[PDB]
Amino acid sequence: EQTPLQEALNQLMRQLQRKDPSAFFSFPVTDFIAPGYSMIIKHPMDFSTMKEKIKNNDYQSIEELKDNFKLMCTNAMIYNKPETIYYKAAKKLLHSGMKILSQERIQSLKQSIDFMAD
Ligand SMILES: CC(=O)c1cc(-c2cc(C(=O)NC3CC3)ccc2C)c2ncccn12
């Protein structure tokens, strides 16, 4: 039902989402709640979309998930003005998420994935 890589990606997801208690990054931003979003942000990302990419096996590496997570936070800091709650929340989430997605945890998880293979 899940490969070791999928299991590892799903666990990181849960860890990252716990750093978004406001649930602002849980779901895709739409043009209705953020006017002109689709004209400014060319590659949207959110936790629910990351969740489908894992289930659909779109990720070949943990680094890909980390890139998507950074994209999530980068999009929010580009679209939202610094005085907004969403900008501040993106900065807090980026800092907390990058500690979760440290080189040491990523390398540790990659070692485990290889040990569970073949
Ligand atoms: C990531 C980001 O840029 C973003 C996220 C949201 C958003 C807000 C709420 C919410 O609860 N809003 C009420 C507190 C006022 C719920 C879910 C989402 C996806 C948002 N809304 C407008 C502009 C930007 N954003």
Curated annotation (Swiss-Prot):
Protein name, UniProt field: Bromodomain-containing protein 7
Domain of life of the organism encoding this protein: Eukaryota
Residue ranges of every copy of the Bromo domain listed in the record: 1-104
Location in chain, cross-link Glycyl lysine isopeptide (Lys-Gly) (interchain with G-Cter in SUMO2): K55, K66, K70, K81, K110
Function: Acts both as coactivator and as corepressor. May play a role in chromatin remodeling. Activator of the Wnt signaling pathway in a DVL1-dependent manner by negatively regulating the GSK3B phosphotransferase activity. Induces dephosphorylation of GSK3B at 'Tyr-216'. Down-regulates TRIM24-mediated activation of transcriptional activation by AR. Transcriptional corepressor that down-regulates the expression of target genes. Binds to target promoters, leading to increased histone H3 acetylation at 'Lys-9' (H3K9ac). Binds to the ESR1 promoter. Recruits BRCA1 and POU2F1 to the ESR1 promoter.
Residues of the full protein shown: 132 to 249 of 651
Complex and partners: Interacts with TRIM24, PTPN13 and DVL1. Identified in a complex with SMARCA4/BRG1, SMARCC1/BAF155, SMARCE1/BAF57, DPF2/BAF45D and ARID2, subunits of the SWI/SNF-B (PBAF) chromatin remodeling complex. Interacts with IRF2 and HNRPUL1. Interacts (via N-terminus) with TP53. Interacts (via C-terminus) with EP300. Interacts with BRCA1. Interacts (via bromo domain) with histone H3 (via N-terminus) acetylated at 'Lys-14' (H3K14ac). Has low affinity for histone H3 acetylated at 'Lys-9' (H3K9ac).
Location of the protein in the cell: Nucleus; Chromosome
TM annotation in the entry: none
